[PDB]
Ligand binder design. Structure first.
Ligand SMILES: Nc1ncnc2c1ncn2[C@@H]1O[C@H](COP(=O)(O)OP(=O)(O)O)[C@@H](O)[C@H]1O
Ligand SMILES: Nc1ncnc2c1ncn2[C@@H]1O[C@H](COP(=O)(O)OP(=O)(O)O)[C@@H](O)[C@H]1O
Ligand SMILES: [Mg+2]
Lengths: 646, 302, 347
């Protein structure tokens, strides 16, 4: 029951908020909940209205492009016209939950239709109908809303004329004790699967809460704009631990500690951009495990030393590095044989990125958002991973002579293939495929909810529902109501659709709005590959220059500083060549004033390939000249010996 | 000569890849720091290295200069980088839009000029890649992602033939097909997808290039005799090297299967090579003296 | 006599220069025929395996499949059909006296690489089957050397076929099995149930006499008259499934009875299963988990597992033909791995 998003552990803060929320509704007063993005406004909101014997739920989410027509249509499925507007129920009142009311944007004259409509129905107790000029009196229908603070970009500050009629509640973050209790309950539910470790539920929860607190304190927003932490990270940690325990083998204490460390690595430290920050997180994991789980026989807790994968076996267990590398090599050879062919080099970082992408793509509603330098292996790596799991890859062919119609048609085809044909789809979205803000709005609608409602309307809506009913009757499921068909359809879409976002230049404003968008940030899984470190560069260069003859001359090993050589210590000319190429790449990127921008390693790979080809050609020419002069000198020596003999 | 092959290959490959989009001062600074890095890690390079002399021959230089290329060494290096980028599609940045003529003269009638602001652009591009004609695409600032599998070379081998996916259909390729992309506005926004996967070069004229062109012009008109003498010695040395190679091949053929006449010709040729090298050894530092003499004109001009 | 089980260790080991793609057994003499990934066809003696009896390179690219047959004319010899990625199909002949390969003819016509080949004889007429990446299954004649009929049953490329009389089944990359009547050229039924592309499909053949068999016995005189009851498939989803072949209107397909239905599904492979082969009442299979498994038809559970049989993948497996009384079922089994090991199991 840990995958159900409506499961709420009742703590004292939740009960207090439910009580004051009920008291505020019963006073006939609007409610605005404002707080940090992981505070739990929607969760407490839906938990309070779900177990209510007096109020119903009208779940609507506001966007940048929102009109009063959406609100009126959402009322029409729960309200009846008798002039007076009344809910369909006779006893239960109606509550409109409007999530993210800050998202609607002002016009060119600094006002929004939706907030004024809410103010009109919330102060004058009704509204004026447009097509026949009638006043619709509302007598028992309530109204609430939730929003993030307007300090962060994307949240439009809203007029006091509307907020003066609604009581504002600030939902802060839960304290340390509350989080410890909640995830103690969560880990008890998880460890019910493993009965021999029931006594370790409390220290694991305390370790996770301390990890979240330290990660929020250290990696603040001042370093990077996407360093935003929340209890949703802890919930994703619990869900990942469950997903790994459920399909895994029998687990010991060391295996469970390493598994929790792997999940913490893949959730808290996927988005870390610096090597020093990743070292700080590794030290943090060491300190947390030492303080809260004092167990010996624990290996390295580095990212490369924690390789959990279910590809090599029938269960999610910790695989060896060499066997995994061999399996990835053979699978990639088969993939290049059966699909597009590129000359990739298998290094440790690529194996780790394959593992985390495969972990994310195996989750229900598992979307991805990959950030890094160009030519770091994101699109081809996602294609290979989707080929391993059998996901059908759909790539939008968006060019400059395109508009929202072509993108909408591509998305419609993807949705139809996902539902009507029951084929798992891995839609890979690049930042170059998004030109205007409307594409980002469509992607936000697809990610935040499980469907874009504005895509289907009228005759298209009718034929889509007819096809949906035909598909439901084809599988022998007794569904007749429109709500059952619609929520089964959005469940199928949320089950069999994976969207992978590829971002190459996060410094750019378009990619900045792509990352900072609330629907993409709170749903997708960030994976900051960034630029290549010197170890990966050394591995790639050593795997790329070992196929060419380079050791022909004597090479004197010099004396150098320890930190001026990044490759393993120099013994042959290949190590010196690799170190020279890495050093010049670093110097060139440093002296071109690139700043804190990611460094595309395309220059390095192109230089390696050009060096290999040039060394091959030059050594062939030199060997040809050597053979020619040797043959000539031997012939001349034979001739002079014959002359001296006779 | 053999002990200094790896360092020269490293320098030439780095010069081909990294230095496409740098002006002359930054090219010299990066080259001297690369030479310092080679000297630090105990790899021996050529002390008198020159990129044009090492990589391309005199025949290619004469072919480029006859086709319409400028006499500048920066433009010669850029053209050599463009013609040696067999894997990455070269990206030419011409403020004057002149190199289209040079490439057309190099490839003759096989060249086809397209643009990114056309309507039948994609269909004639598919026809050209099916036939195998050299394609030059202008207005590179408005790159259209239809050729994203031609830029990244994401081909699939359909057995005995190679195929690329353009649009919603599979089109064949040819072994002699070459793609060129042309740009005219240096301030245009090149997409990162193309920019990371092309051999971007700069045929621009900068203030350091003003200094070099000022020196070139004052050497051409102030003392033309030294310039034509150096050109004559270079051409004579190349022709004499070819003649010595031909005489060596003839002597090897004679030894394998007259001999005195061939030996006398080889000895006379070798003495002529020695005399020519001795004459040219005492003439090169005069050019360096003239460079040291014509620095104030460059400084005043810039 | 059909209850032979190989021991836990190989009887002998064979060294090859490159990866082994397909292995077949000579049905009269103890000689193996081991293909390579460099197009080379080898031949080793089971008592003298230090040096090959022959080594012929006739394919530019890697050999994809192999199937041998001993000719029965109402002179008798061996016909070895090797298929490869060099766009060609080559038909050989084994010279028993001189231990040499003498090519009879080469068969062309496919637009892409080929995957599997089969050869069978109905009544004094030898035919060679093949499947290719061009989504078309075309068969040839051994004497004429010209194509007879072709058909495209699948949207994507087929991967494995098998033959019996005038019926051809074909697994493919769109995870759908199809059984096509070759003279009619129309698919009788379509398969569904595997989540990954199919690897090897072959017909399940009946037996003459046994105490009890659940998978090779026709349950009715209608099945006996039809001559086909069940078929077995292996695919990249680590599963082996048994399909019941629906019988259409009698050949014209039945809209209400034109779909395969899975009967018994065997699981336990840690990676992709590559090749299968049925012998007696045992379903031998090899996979990519460096192992060879010995399934059982009756109980539906594995009896013997050979863990770590190879360093790399286990590409191909082959045993002797048991269903035909003309070809004796001798007690040798040879496996073929990716790690250049053609292990042979005898006695
Ligand atoms: N008291 C609590 N009990 C259980 N889970 C909680 C509690 N407080 C916060 N959470 C976790 O925090 C997350 C808040 O999610 P959500 O309500 O969507 O935040 P918001 O609505 O502010 O975006 C939930 O996923 C939940 O797992
Ligand atoms: N080991 C490697 N890791 C990453 N990229 C590599 C490796 N080896 C080669 N490449 C280069 O990466 C390119 C593919 O990058 P791609 O994934 O398309 O870039 P992006 O991640 O921006 O989509 C290939 O053209 C290849 O030259
Ligand atoms: Mg929220």
């Amino acid at each position: 029951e840990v995958m159900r998003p409506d499961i709420v552990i009742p703590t004292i803060d939740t009960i207090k908020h439910e009580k004051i929320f009920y008291d505020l509704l019963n006073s006939k007063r609007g409610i605005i909940l404002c707080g940090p993005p992981g505070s739990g406004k929607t969760m407490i909101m839906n938990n309070a209205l779900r177990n209510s014997s007096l109020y119903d739920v009208v779940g609507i989410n506001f966007s940048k492009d929102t009109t009063t027509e959406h609100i009126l249509s959402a009322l029409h499925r729960h309200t009846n016209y008798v002039l007076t507007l009344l809910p369909k129920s006779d006893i239960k009142n109606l509550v409109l939950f409007c999530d993210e009311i800050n998202l609607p944007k002002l016009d060119k004259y600094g006002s929004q239709n939706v907030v004024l409509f809410l103010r009109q129905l919330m102060e004058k107790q009704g509204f004026w109908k447009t097509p026949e000029n009638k006043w619709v009196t509302i007598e028992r229908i309530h109204i609430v809303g939730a929003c993030n603070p307007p300090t962060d970009p994307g949240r439009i500050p809203m007029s006091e004329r509307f907020t003066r009629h609604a009581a504002i509640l600030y939902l802060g973050y839960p304290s340390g004790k509350s989080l410890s209790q909640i995830y103690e309950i969560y880990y008890k539910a998880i460890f019910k699967l493993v009965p021999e470790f029931r006594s370790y539920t409390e220290p694991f929860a305390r370790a996770s809460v301390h990890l979240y607190n330290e990660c929020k304190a250290r990696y603040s927003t001042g370093l990077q704009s996407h360093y935003l932490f929340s209890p949703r990270e802890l919930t994703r940690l619990v869900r990942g631990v469950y997903t790994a325990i459920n399909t895994g083998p029998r687990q010991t204490l060391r295996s469970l500690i390493r598994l929790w460390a792997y999940e913490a690595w893949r959730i808290f430290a996927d988005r870390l951009v610096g090597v020093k920050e990743k070292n700080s997180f590794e030290q943090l994991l060491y300190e947390t495990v030492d303080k809260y789980l004092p167990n010996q026989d624990l290996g390295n807790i580095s990212s490369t030393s924690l390789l959990f994968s279910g590809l090599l076996s029938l269960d999610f267990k910790e695989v060896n590095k060499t066997d995994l590398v061999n399996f990835i090599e053979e699978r990639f050879k088969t993939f290049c044989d059966e699909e597009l062919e590129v000359p990739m080099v298998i290094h440790e970082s690529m194996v780790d990125h394959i593992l985390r992408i495969d972990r994310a793509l195996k989750q229900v509603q598992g979307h991805m958002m990959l950030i890094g330098a160009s030519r770091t292996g994101k699109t081809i790596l996602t294609r290979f991973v989707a080929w391993l799991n059998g996901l059908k890859i759909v790539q939008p062919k968006i060019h400059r002579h395109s508009n929202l119609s072509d993108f909408d048609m591509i998305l419609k085809k993807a949705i139809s293939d996902c539902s009507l044909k029951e084929s798992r789809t891995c839609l890979i979205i690049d930042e170059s495929n998004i030109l205007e803000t409307a594409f980002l709005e469509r992607m936000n609608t697809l990610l935040a909810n499980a469907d874009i409602p504005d895509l289907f309307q009228g005759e298209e809506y009718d034929k889509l529902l007819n096809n949906l009913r035909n598909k439901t009757r084809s599988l022998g499921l007794l569904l007749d109501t429109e709500q059952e068909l619609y929520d089964w359809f959005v469940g199928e879409i949320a089950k069999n659709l994976h969207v992978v976002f590829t971002i190459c230049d996060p410094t750019n404003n378009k990619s900045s709005a792509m990352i900072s968008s609330p629907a993409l940030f709170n749903r997708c899984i960030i994976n900051w590959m960034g630029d290549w470190d010197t170890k990966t560069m050394s591995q790639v260069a050593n795997n790329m220059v070992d196929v060419v003859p380079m050791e022909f001359t004597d090479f004197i090993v010099p004396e150098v500083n320890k930190e001026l050589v990044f490759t393993e210590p120099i013994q042959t000319i290949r190590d010196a060549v690799v170190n020279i190429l890495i050093h010049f790449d670093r110097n060139f990127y440093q002296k071109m004033k690139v700043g804190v921008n990611p460094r595309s390693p395309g220059y390095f790979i192109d230089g390696l390939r050009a060096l290999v080809k040039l060394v091959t050609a030059k050594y062939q020419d030199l060997q040809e000249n050597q053979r020619f002069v040797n043959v000539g000198l031997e012939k001349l020596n034979e001739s002079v010996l014959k002359v001296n003999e006779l | 000569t053999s002990q200094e092959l790896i360092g020269n290959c490293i320098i030439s490959s780095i010069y081909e890849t990294y230095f496409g989009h740098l002006n002359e001062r930054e090219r010299g600074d990066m080259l001297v720091i690369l030479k310092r890095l080679l000297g630090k890690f105990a790899v021996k390079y050529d002390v008198n290295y020159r990129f044009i002399d090492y990589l391309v021959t005199l025949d290619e230089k004469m072919k480029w200069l006859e086709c319409g290329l400028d006499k500048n060494d920066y433009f010669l290096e850029n053209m050599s980088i463009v013609m040696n980028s067999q894997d990455a599609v070269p990206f030419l940045l011409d403020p004057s839009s002149h190199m289209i003529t040079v490439i057309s003269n190099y490839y003759g009638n096989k060249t086809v000029l397209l643009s990114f602001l056309e309507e039948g652009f994609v269909k004639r591009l598919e026809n050209a890649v099916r036939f195998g004609s050299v394609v030059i695409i202008q207005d590179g600032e408005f790159f259209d992602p239809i050729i994203s599998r031609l830029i990244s070379r994401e081909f699939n081998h359909a057995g005995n033939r190679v195929t690329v996916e353009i649009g919603d259909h599979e089109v064949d390729v040819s072994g002699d097909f070459k793609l060129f992309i042309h740009s005219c506005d240096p301030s245009g926004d090149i997409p990162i997808f193309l920019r990371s996967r092309v051999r971007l070069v700069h045929f621009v004229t900068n203030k350091e290039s003003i200094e070099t062109r000022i020196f070139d012009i004052t050497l051409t008109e102030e003392n033309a005799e030294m310039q034509r003498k150096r050109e004559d010695l270079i051409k004579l040395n190349t022709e004499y090297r070819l003649k010595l190679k031909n005489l060596e091949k003839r002597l090897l053929e004679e030894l394998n299967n007259e001999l005195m006449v061939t030996l006398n010709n080889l000895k006379k040729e070798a003495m002529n090579i020695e005399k020519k090298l001795s004459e040219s050894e005492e003439f090169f530092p005069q050019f360096d003296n003239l460079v040291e003499e014509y620095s104030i004109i460059g400084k005043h001009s810039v | 006599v059909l209850k032979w089980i190989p021991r836990n260790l190989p009887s002998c080991l064979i060294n090859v220069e490159s990866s082994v793609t397909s292995v077949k057994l000579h049905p009269n003499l103890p000689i193996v025929f081991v293909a390579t990934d460099h197009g080379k066809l080898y031949a080793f003696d089971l008592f003298n395996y230090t040096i090959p009896l022959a080594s012929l390179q006739s394919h530019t690219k890697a050999i994809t499949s192999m199937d041998v047959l001993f000719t029965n004319y109402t002179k008798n010899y061996l016909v070895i059909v090797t298929a490869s990625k060099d766009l060609q199909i080559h038909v050989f002949k084994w010279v028993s006296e001189e231990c040499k390969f003498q090519q009879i003819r080469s068969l062309l016509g496919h637009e892409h690489i080929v995957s599997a080949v089969k050869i069978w004889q109905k009544n004094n007429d030898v035919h060679i089957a093949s499947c290719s990446r061009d989504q078309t299954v075309k068969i040839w004649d051994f004497h004429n050397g010209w194509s007879l009929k072709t058909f495209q049953p699948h949207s994507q490329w087929v991967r494995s076929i098998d033959v019996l009389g005038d019926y051809i089944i074909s697994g493919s990359h769109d995870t759908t099995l199809r059984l096509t009547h070759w003279p009619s050229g129309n698919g009788l039924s379509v398969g569904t149930g595997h989540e990954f592309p199919i690897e090897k499909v072959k017909f399940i053949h009946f037996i003459e006499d046994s105490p009890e068999i659940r998978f090779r016995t026709p349950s009715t005189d209608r099945y006996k008259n039809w001559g086909m009851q069940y078929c077995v498939s292996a695919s990249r989803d680590r599963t082996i499934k048994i399909w019941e072949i629906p019988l259409p209107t009698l050949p014209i397909p039945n809209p209400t009875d034109s779909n395969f239905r899975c009967v018994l599904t065997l699981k336990g492979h840690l990676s992709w299963v590559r090749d299968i082969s049925i012998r007696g009442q045992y379903l031998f299979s090899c996979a990519d988990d460096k192992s060879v498994r010995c399934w059982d038809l009756n109980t539906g559970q594995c009896l013997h597992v050979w863990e770590k049989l190879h360093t790399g993948f286990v590409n191909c497996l082959d045993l002797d033909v048991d269903f035909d009384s003309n070809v004796t079922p001798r007690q040798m089994m040879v496996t073929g791995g990716l790690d250049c090991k053609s292990n042979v199991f005898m006695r």
